[PDB]
Design a protein around this ligand. Structure first.
Ligand SMILES: CCCCCCCCCCCCCCCCCC(=O)OC[C@H](COP(=O)(O)OCCN)OC(=O)CCCCCCCCCCCCCCCCC
Ligand SMILES: CCCCCCCCCCCCCCCCCC(=O)OC[C@H](COP(=O)(O)OCCN)OC(=O)CCCCCCCCCCCCCCCCC
Ligand SMILES: CCCCCCCCCCCCO[C@@H]1O[C@H](CO)[C@@H](O[C@H]2O[C@H](CO)[C@@H](O)[C@H](O)[C@H]2O)[C@H](O)[C@H]1O
Ligand SMILES: CCCCCCCCCCCCO[C@@H]1O[C@H](CO)[C@@H](O[C@H]2O[C@H](CO)[C@@H](O)[C@H](O)[C@H]2O)[C@H](O)[C@H]1O
Ligand SMILES: CCCCCCCCCCCCO[C@@H]1O[C@H](CO)[C@@H](O[C@H]2O[C@H](CO)[C@@H](O)[C@H](O)[C@H]2O)[C@H](O)[C@H]1O
Ligand SMILES: CCCCCCCCCCCCO[C@@H]1O[C@H](CO)[C@@H](O[C@H]2O[C@H](CO)[C@@H](O)[C@H](O)[C@H]2O)[C@H](O)[C@H]1O
Ligand SMILES: *C(=O)CCCCCCCCCCCCC
Lengths: 42, 126, 67, 155, 121, 84, 171, 459, 275, 170, 103, 12
């Protein structure tokens, strides 16, 4: 039972594993291109 | 699908039909095998555990093995149709085989060199 | 040590390993997205591939049958 | 070791067989010499042609690495059956089936590679064109013999 | 692929042989066919030390790119424009080879067609 | 770093999670057959649970002899050179 | 040398370990482990031993067909990835007898206690030999079993190489 | 050569007039000094040999063999002084005298200008060698080994004597410098076939050629350590050195007469190499390894090319040090367990760490790891036999694989695995033993930095 | 060399599909990747073969280092069937393992993409053995499958390791060493490809289906690998096929060759040569 | 330090720096650091050593071998003349080995120097290598390990006889 | 199928001895009785001096004054020359390429 | 605690 409880209860799925860090990678990416659009625009 | 044993893959002991059909005569033999093994084990352990011993516990089985694998062969060798044919087949045969391989190769090479059809343009090391 | 083993339980984790691991996972995805934004041709195609069936006989120098 | 404890000639009488079995620490019912041809085995026992890897690894062998006990008769080919060399252990797949599948796989692949050479893949393009008479001079061509011209045209 | 199915499964007689093409004269059907111009001289390619397989009809763009790379060091992200000009020239070169293949294919199909016309009397 | 008490606790911990043993009538000297009323198939499963617990194999010739928790503790302490 | 019971219980343990290798997941393994245990339980009370042997033989043929070709092996079991790994670090205790006096001088307490063990071994040996003589039938021992010490102050015969064997993790 | 003959002779009064307890110290020290002076023979010229007098000359072939010979004497005294400790004083001195007299014959043998003088000294080396094996060998079979050694040699060397005397009658001289200029081609005839065989068989038996090699595994298994060292290091090379000289006067008949002996060597080396994989006695295994290495030398000598002659010379020197090392390594185990059985004492790297390093280094040279001179010699032979016939590379390549297998098999079996439980007398390596091993390998590996001095006249 | 590399890359990738020892899966991964380099030699692209050597060095070395991190934390356990549930327990080794697997499978713009994808396009558009080309593409799909196998069984699901938990990847020597190779596994290919001087004329004109073949077969490999992995959770018991046994036992090549050839040679030595 | 005619070298043509970037060249600064930290101290030590050498100038010479009659002028079995002819032949043979080595060295340096243009720009070196190797092969190839001036002369006469025979039938 | 009472007694006695032996392997406190950022840069400063600067001095001295004083010991690939380059040795100016056709 | 490590003599 211990293998299905506590900190082991919820593991990611395979697609969830590949997308580790995608949220912040996307947040940084969006800020980076927006800045680049700004610099080019000037 | 039955197990087919080979020289390099033995029949598993659990699939051996003689493993289960065990008679009182077969249990008697297994007991005698364990008595020989136990008698030798005791003889070994009495020397192995002796605090005053320093050296090698000579093993007659090892001595018999090394003696058999050398000195004991020729005395028990008999020239007959088997050893003579194996003696000829793998003793003279390879020498004759390789002689013709190399002799034929070298005759062909020497004939081309004399006729000037072997390319030795930069061959000055030999 | 500073990490003591646990019995039948999820192990003790430090903040350093979690933060560092996420930063490099986030770094991986930013890099892919950033590269894909500017270099999408490296994945999809650099130049158009023509249809040879749409080349006229005139530009390929194909004379008419009775020539 | 006295000479009575060393290997001797092939045993002929039943009494010799009993003597040989005892010298080799075997039951006379188990002792069996190699067939008496000219080979030269003498009376040395013929034991099962089995690797040491097949012996029980949990038993307390006097020689754990070899899985031998002191005093037990050694197989004639013991040095070929150490655990570093020839294994005869049972296999999960029959020996003959393994040879069929391995050879069949290799033979099939060789056939297809020959097929693939006879019908190669390629793109629908003409030859690559090079200037200066197909780079006649750059490729080491003799500069005193004019090359046969190679002319390329626009399309 | 597609052309390979036609040649190997279909009729090989109307498909180009990549190892023999062209099999028709360059000017056959092409009144006043121009010569391929060459911008880089042999000496320039020799001095630039281009790989022989790079000494093709786009070498002038490769030479321009190579010079930019050496001059822009340590900025290895420069010379993108020069690199694209060389890549684009090679694309046009490849398309010309596609045209040669397609031209050869249609001439073979014409040759066969005339032979049906000739022997159907 | 195993200790004699650590081995004993884990051996009894595993047995207390086995539905066929009453956790209140279990001591380090309880005999699996003569006291807890188990059979040899049950004993084989107990040994397998200990092997998983401590991550090593117990050979069949030795395993069949371990018939109480204390014997298992003694067997494991011997293999692992545990003396305290 | 194996009874019928020993053969059956060895197959049960062996079959479960190969089953676990196929299943992998614990919940899946638990499910099929109970199904396999049921199969052994249906023929638990077979009395006709001819039938019992036939059941064992057929079961072994079934195991051979369905065994995992690459079963799990505990790392330090024979055939495991750590088997014999630390044998190169195991040094026999007699090697300390050849240490230079300056080497022994670095561990004055260890070698003083070592001399006590050597004294204990020396003074126990004659009684160990005698005990084995008087307990061994005429034709030598018939099994490899050894006896305990009988009196107080005696040590079990042939104890030294068991008690002083190298540690499993000697370095 | 008198500057080497006389101090070698003086070693005998030194040993007999030494204090009882200083025979090993004195003989070892002064034979090392003689070895030091032997480096003066390196005064070699590009065109001419070093022609000392009417009796003795040195060239690039004999010089490396001379230096190996004089180096081995102190090494042999080091190796012998332990197993001879119980021997009484007079018999210890007689043993040392036999070693000294062997060196005297050897240095004269390798520098004799006249071939009949070379013959007598070539034969004289049998006497002390036979005495060392039969008198100071350990086992009953040393007497048989002495006989096989004696009669294999004489069966071949007596016909050589007749051939040599016949050549002198026909040519007028046996001086090797004279023969270089008065040599005449050997025409085809049955008389010349047997003249060729008489001129060669004695050297083949010593090498030994495959088929005439059965005396050598016997001699090694029975000889004391010093006997094995000199046998493997130098005495085998008497055949090679003899062949390298006498082939001068056998052309062009060698073109076709060499074929049967090339087949025996080419196939012989694979057989003997394969045999090593199954040997149970460590000395016997090393002995069979020598037959395989020397089969390369026979081929190299018989095909007569500059590359093959350079490779033959390097191989002879390289094998001399390597095989002598291997016997010394095997002997150091014997002095502890008193058995030559390879499988008896295992896992010795756990008990003798530094001795296992010497075992590793010796094995690596035996399998010819580049850039050791063992590999240089083998490679030069492989290059030259490829031109002789491209197919030989298959046989040469297979032997290289088998050589690695049996060399590492010997290392693995004795040094690795688990130690044998009951062998509890493996005492730590002595300074003498460690110094003996390093006095083999260090000059061997140093020669890699200047290989030209062991490449011979064709360099 | 083209055909030698193609059979190697296909055969060893097939073997990796069923291996359970983590070090052996990655070992067979190397053999498969070496075969691809040998294919690149076969299609006359030596500088592409060299580039793959350089890129492969980063993520392959990381993958072994990550596996060593797992093996150490599980007290020298190397069987993936005894791993599981490590995605959160070892977050940094997980990140490195995922990055390394994505670089190996040619995820765009990671270090492995700058060599493998160019190799696949070069092979796709070359005048080449058709069979060798197909074997190479299938082996590319198999790369996705056996990489999925490591991630699925080592990191996801529930723990299958013993009860005394000794997981700990918090040593700076471990973290820093893997960290540097993680940075290389992301950017090294981009940095190298943008600095080396051109020595060929890279083929950049091709149909859409020859340009994206590497990406598609890799994606299909991942999807198919997920179907197989998830089916191991169903409460169904399956008998083994010949294909499964052939893959697990490595085509029987070691079993047949390492018994037969040593037996024949060693038997010749004692029976005929010696005696 | 060496004769430039024996070991020729084309005049080296180095392009001048022509930057097209505002970034500094790290190689330029490392070159300055290397010149300051490595070259200058090394040069100072050498100049000290060269000053000591200039205080003890002494000479060595290249040995000159006068020509002696060759094997063609030696009476059969006249060892005294044969010996001097043979030693001279052996010295010439060693010299001819080094002449081939010089030409091979020229060829190898051209190949590296000319880079990707080596197949065209090294024709003269390749031609010279081909000719000397042919000349060397004629003289010395196939003589065997026990070579001599006698065997070399016999080979030459065999070649001369073949050349005359062909010329006659022509 | 458990221990016989004699097997149990022997194991208990060996177990007592084995545990005593293992305890006696512990070292006493005195054993082994042995016979008689500023820092970080300095550690790396001494290493750079002895393992980079000293070796490079020796190699440069060896290359400059022994190796490069012999023919063909160091052979460089000759520098690439592009249209529009200037030569330092001579001052020669390499002419530019033709005008490119528009593309 | 610290345990004695049995090694062969390293002095020689
Ligand atoms: C060309 C001519 C080449 C000549 C080759 C000679 C080869 C000699 C034969 C070997 C002699 C054996 C020496 C003793 C070594 C030995 O016994 O090792 C046994 C070893 C077992 O290893 P293993 O199966 O992993 O078991 C470990 C767990 N117990 O198993 C082994 O390690 C030995 C396995 C190697 C067996 C030889 C296989 C040769 C394969 C050649 C085929 C390839 C042909 C070229 C490539 C194809 C073209 C691209
Ligand atoms: C054991 C019992 C058998 C005893 C041996 C039997 C005798 C074998 C004789 C072989 C023939 C040699 C011979 O007789 O040649 C004589 C001939 C002399 O004639 P001549 O005028 O000088 O020169 C012109 C040549 N007609 O020409 C010659 O003289 C050339 C012969 C040179 C000297 C030959 C030396 C003896 C050759 C026989 C041994 C060769 C084989 C050695 C094998 C040993 C193996 C370990
Ligand atoms: C050139 C640009 C390159 C890209 C640079 C991108 C930098 C981005 C840095 C982001 C740092 C995020 O740091 C990490 O984020 C994750 C988000 O799940 C947090 O994790 C969070 O969710 C998990 C469960 O999902 C829980 O543990 C908890 O709710 C919280 O910790 C970590 O606690 C935090 O340590
Ligand atoms: C992209 C992949 C490219 C490579 C694909 C290669 C696949 C080719 C496989 C060829 C080898 C098949 O070889 C063949 O297998 C079948 C099934 O076991 C065997 O069939 C036999 O064995 C089985 C099992 O014992 C029994 O049903 C029966 O004895 C018999 O049918 C044949 O005796 C064998 O000749
Ligand atoms: C005119 C023709 C005769 C020429 C004779 C020339 C030499 C004459 C030498 C006479 C002295 C010989 O000396 C005699 O022999 C040896 C060596 O000295 C000595 O005895 C020796 O014993 C042992 C060696 O066996 C050593 O310790 C040491 O060499 C010496 O003490 C005797 O004690 C001595 O009496
Ligand atoms: C081809 C050139 C070289 C040929 C050399 C051949 C000459 C003979 C060499 C050996 C001479 C030894 O002389 C004698 O040989 C026989 C065997 O051969 C030895 O005898 C040995 O073998 C025989 C036969 O198996 C046994 O019966 C005997 O028990 C054993 O000791 C003698 O003890 C030895 O005295
Ligand atoms: C079109 O541009 C070519 C694309 C390449 C297709 C290769 C097909 C491979 C199928 C198996 C080959 C069998 C051997 C003939």
């Amino acid at each position: 039972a211990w293998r299905y409880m506590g900190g082991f209860a919820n593991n990611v799925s395979f697609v969830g594993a590949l997308l580790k860090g995608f949220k912040w990678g996307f947040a940084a990416f969006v800020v980076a291109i927006g800045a680049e659009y700004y610099l080019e625009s000037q | 699908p039955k197990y087919e044993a080979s020289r390099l893959s033995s029949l598993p002991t659990t699939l051996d039909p003689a493993e289960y059909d065990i008679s009182s005569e077969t249990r008697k033999a297994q007991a005698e095998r364990l008595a020989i093994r136990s008698r030798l084990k005791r003889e070994y352990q009495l020397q192995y555990y002796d605090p005053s011993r320093r050296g090698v516990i000579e093993d007659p089985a090892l001595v018999r093995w090394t003696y058999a694998r050398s000195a004991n062969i020729y005395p028990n060798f008999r020239p007959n149709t088997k050893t003579s044919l194996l003696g000829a087949l793998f003793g003279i045969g390879p020498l004759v085989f390789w002689y013709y391989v190399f002799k034929t190769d070298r005759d062909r090479k020497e004939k081309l060199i004399q006729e000037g059809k072997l390319d030795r343009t930069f061959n000055i090391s030999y | 040590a500073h990490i003591e083993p646990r019995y039948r339980q999820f192990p003790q984790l430090t903040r350093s390993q979690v933060i560092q691991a996420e930063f490099f996972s986030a770094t991986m995805w930013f890099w892919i997205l950033w590269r894909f934004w500017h270099d999408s041709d490296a994945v999809l195609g650099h130049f158009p591939y023509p249809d040879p069936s749409q080349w006229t006989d005139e530009e390929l120098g194909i004379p008419p049958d009775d020539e | 070791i006295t000479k009575d404890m060393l290997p001797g000639p092939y045993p002929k009488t039943p009494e010799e067989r009993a003597a040989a079995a005892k010298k080799y620490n075997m039951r006379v019912e188990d002792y069996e010499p190699y067939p008496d041809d000219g080979t030269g085995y003498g009376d040395y026992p013929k034991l099962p042609d089995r690797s040491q890897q097949e012996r029980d690894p949990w038993y307390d062998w006097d020689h754990p690495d070899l899985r031998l006990n002191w005093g037990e008769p050694m197989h004639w080919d013991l040095d070929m059956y150490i655990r570093n060399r020839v294994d005869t252990s049972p296999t999960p797949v029959n020996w003959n089936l393994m040879c069929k599948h391995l050879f069949g796989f290799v033979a099939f692949m060789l056939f297809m590679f020959w097929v693939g050479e006879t019908y190669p893949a390629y793109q629908p393009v003409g030859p690559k064109q090079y200037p200066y008479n197909n780079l006649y001079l750059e490729r080491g061509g003799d500069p005193n013999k004019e090359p046969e011209p190679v002319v390329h045209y626009e399309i | 692929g597609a052309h390979l199915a036609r040649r190997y499964l279909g009729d090989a007689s109307v498909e180009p042989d990549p190892l023999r093409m062209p099999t028709f004269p360059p000017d056959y059907g092409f009144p006043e066919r121009k010569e391929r111009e060459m911008v880089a001289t042999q000496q320039e390619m020799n001095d630039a030390q281009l790989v022989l397989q790079q000494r093709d009809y786009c070498a002038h763009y490769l030479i321009r790119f190579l010079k930019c790379k050496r001059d822009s060091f340590p900025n290895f992200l420069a010379c993108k424009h020069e690199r694209h000009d060389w890549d684009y020239c090679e694309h046009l070169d490849y398309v010309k080879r596609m045209k040669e293949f397609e031209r050869e294919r249609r001439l073979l199909q014409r040759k066969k067609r005339r032979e049906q016309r000739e022997a159907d009397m | 770093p195993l200790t004699l008490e650590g081995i004993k606790d884990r051996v009894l911990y595993v047995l207390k999670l086995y539905d066929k043993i009453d956790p209140e009538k279990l001591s380090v000297n309880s005999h699996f057959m003569k006291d807890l009323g188990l059979d040899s198939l049950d004993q084989v499963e107990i040994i397998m649970a200990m092997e998983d617990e401590f991550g090593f194999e117990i050979p069949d010739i030795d395993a069949e002899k371990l018939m109480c928790p204390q014997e298992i503790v003694d067997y494991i302490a011997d293999k692992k050179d545990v003396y305290e | 040398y194996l009874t019928h019971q020993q053969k059956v219980l060895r197959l049960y343990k062996r079959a479960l370990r190969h089953l676990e290798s196929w299943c992998i997941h614990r919940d899946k393994y638990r499910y099929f482990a109970c199904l396999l245990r049921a199969r052994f339980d249906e023929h638990k009370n077979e009395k006709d031993m001819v039938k019992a042997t036939q059941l064992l033989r057929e079961a072994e043929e079934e195991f051979w067909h369905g065994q995992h070709p690459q079963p799990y092996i505990f790392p330090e079991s024979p055939g495991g990835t750590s088997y014999e790994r630390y044998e190169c670090y195991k040094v026999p205790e007699w090697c300390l007898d050849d240490w230079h006096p300056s080497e022994k001088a670095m561990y004055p307490d260890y070698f003083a206690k070592r001399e006590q063990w050597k004294k204990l071994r020396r003074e126990s040996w004659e009684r160990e030999v005698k005990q084995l003589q008087e307990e061994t039938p005429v034709g030598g021992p018939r099994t490899e079993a050894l006896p305990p010490a009988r009196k107080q102050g005696d040590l079990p015969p042939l104890w030294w190489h068991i008690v002083t064997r190298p540690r499993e993790r000697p370095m | 050569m008198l500057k080497y003959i006389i101090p070698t002779i003086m070693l005998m009064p030194l040993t007999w007039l030494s204090k009882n307890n200083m025979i090993w110290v004195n003989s070892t020290a002064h034979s090392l000094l003689i070895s030091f002076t032997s480096l003066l023979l390196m005064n070699q010229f590009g065109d001419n040999s070093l022609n000392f007098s009417l009796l003795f000359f040195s060239d690039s072939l004999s010089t490396p063999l001379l230096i190996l010979t004089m180096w081995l004497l102190p090494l042999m005294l080091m190796a012998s002084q332990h197993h001879l400790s119980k021997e009484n004083l007079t018999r210890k001195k007689l043993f040392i005298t036999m070693l000294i007299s062997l060196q005297l014959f050897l240095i004269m043998t390798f520098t004799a200008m006249e071939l009949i003088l070379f013959y007598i000294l070539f034969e004289a080396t049998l006497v002390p060698t036979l005495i060392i094996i039969t008198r100071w060998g350990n086992q009953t079979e040393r007497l048989n080994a002495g006989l096989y050694f004696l009669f294999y040699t004489l069966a071949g060397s007596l016909p050589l004597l007749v051939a040599l005397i016949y050549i002198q009658n026909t040519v007028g001289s046996l001086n090797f410098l004279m023969l270089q200029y008065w040599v005449q081609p050997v025409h085809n005839s049955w008389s010349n076939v047997f003249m060729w065989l008489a001129c060669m068989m004695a050297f083949m038996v010593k090498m030994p050629l495959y088929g005439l090699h059965l005396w050598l595994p016997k001699a090694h298994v029975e000889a004391p350590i010093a006997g094995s060292m000199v046998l493997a290091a130098v005495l085998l090379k008497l055949g090679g050195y003899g062949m390298l000289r006498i082939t001068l006067i056998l052309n062009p008949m060698t073109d076709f007469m060499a074929y049967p002996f090339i087949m025996l060597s080419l196939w012989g080396m694979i057989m003997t190499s394969s045999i090593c994989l199954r040997q149970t006695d460590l000395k016997s295994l090393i002995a069979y390894s020598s037959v395989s290495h020397m089969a390369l030398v026979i081929v190299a000598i018989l095909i007569q090319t500059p590359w093959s002659y350079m490779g033959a010379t390097a191989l002879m020197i390289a094998h001399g040090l390597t095989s002598s090392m291997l016997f010394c390594l095997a002997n150091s185990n014997y002095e502890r367990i008193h058995s030559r059985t390879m499988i008896l004492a295992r896992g010795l790297q756990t008990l003798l760490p530094l001795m296992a390093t010497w075992w590793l280094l010796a094995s690596l040279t035996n399998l010819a790891l580049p850039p050791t001179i063992n590999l240089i010699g083998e490679l030069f032979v492989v290059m030259s036999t490829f031109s002789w016939s491209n197919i030989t590379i298959i046989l040469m390549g297979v032997n290289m694989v088998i050589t690695a297998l049996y060399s590492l098999y010997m290392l693995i079996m004795t040094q690795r695995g688990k130690y044998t439980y009951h062998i509890n007398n493996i005492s730590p390596s002595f300074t003498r033993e460690n110094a003996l091993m390093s006095l083999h390998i260090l000059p061997l590996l140093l020669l890699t930095l200047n290989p030209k001095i062991i490449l011979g006249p064709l360099y | 060399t083209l055909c030698l590399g193609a059979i190697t890359t296909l055969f060893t990738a097939m073997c990796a599909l069923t291996q359970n020892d983590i070090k052996k899966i990655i070992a067979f991964s190397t053999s498969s990747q070496l075969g691809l380099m040998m294919v690149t030699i076969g299609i006359n692209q030596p500088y592409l073969a060299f580039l793959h050597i350089c890129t492969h060095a980063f993520f392959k070395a990381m993958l072994f280092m990550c596996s060593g991190s797992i093996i150490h934390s599980l007290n020298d356990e190397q069987d993936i069937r005894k791993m599981g549930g490590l995605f959160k327990a070892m977050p940094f080794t997980t990140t490195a393992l995922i990055v390394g697997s994505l670089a190996l499978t040619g995820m765009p713009f990671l270090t492995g993409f700058y060599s493998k994808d160019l190799i696949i396009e070069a092979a796709n558009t070359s005048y080449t053995n058709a069979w060798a080309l197909l074997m190479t593409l299938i082996a590319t799909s198999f790369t996705a499958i056996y990489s999925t196998r490591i991630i699925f069984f080592a990191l996801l699901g529930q723990p299958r390791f013993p009860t005394l938990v000794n997981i700990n990847e918090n040593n700076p020597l471990l973290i820093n060493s893997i960290k540097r190779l993680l940075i290389g596994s992301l950017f090294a290919g981009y940095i190298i490809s943008n600095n080396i001087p051109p020595t060929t004329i890279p083929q950049m004109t091709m149909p859409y289906y020859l340009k994206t073949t590497a990406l598609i077969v890799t994606i299909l490999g991942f999807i198919l690998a997920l179907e197989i992995s998830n089916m191991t959770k169903n409460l169904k018991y399956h008998y083994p096929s010949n294909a499964f046994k052939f893959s697990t036992l490595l085509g029987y090549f070691p079993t047949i060759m390492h018994r037969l050839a040593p037996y024949m040679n060693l038997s010749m030595s004692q029976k005929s040569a010696s005696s | 330090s060496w004769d430039k005619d024996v070991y020729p070298e084309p005049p080296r043509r180095t392009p001048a720096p022509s930057p097209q970037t505002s970034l500094p060249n790290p190689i330029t600064y490392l070159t300055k650091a290397f010149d300051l930290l490595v070259d200058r101290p090394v040069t100072l030590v050498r100049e000290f050593i060269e000053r000591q050498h200039a205080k003890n100038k002494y000479y060595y010479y290249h040995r000159e071998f006068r020509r002696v009659p060759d094997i063609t002028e030696c009476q059969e079995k006249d060892v005294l003349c044969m010996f001097e002819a043979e030693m001279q032949w052996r010295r010439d043979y060693k010299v001819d080995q080094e002449i081939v080595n010089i030409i091979q060295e020229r060829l190898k340096a051209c190949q590296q120097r000319e880079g990707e243009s080596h197949r065209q720009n090294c024709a003269k070196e390749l031609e010279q290598f081909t000719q000397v190797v042919k000349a060397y092969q004629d003289r010395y190839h196939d003589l065997g390990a026990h070579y001599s001036a006698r065997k070399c002369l016999a080979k030459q006469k065999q070649r001369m006889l073949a050349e005359r025979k062909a010329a006659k039938e022509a | 199928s458990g221990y016989t009472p004699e097997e149990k007694l022997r194991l208990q006695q060996l177990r007592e001895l084995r545990r005593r032996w293992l305890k006696d392997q512990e070292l006493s406190p005195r054993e082994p009785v042995l016979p008689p950022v500023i820092y970080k840069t300095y550690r790396h400063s001494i290493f750079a001096f002895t393992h980079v600067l000293i070796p490079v001095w020796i190699i440069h001295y060896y290359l400059k004054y022994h190796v490069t004083t012999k023919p063909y010991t160091i052979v460089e690939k000759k520098p690439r020359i592009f249209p529009g380059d200037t030569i330092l040795e001579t001052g020669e100016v390499i002419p530019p390429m033709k005008e490119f056709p528009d593309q | 605690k610290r345990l004695f490590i049995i090694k062969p003599s390293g002095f020689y």
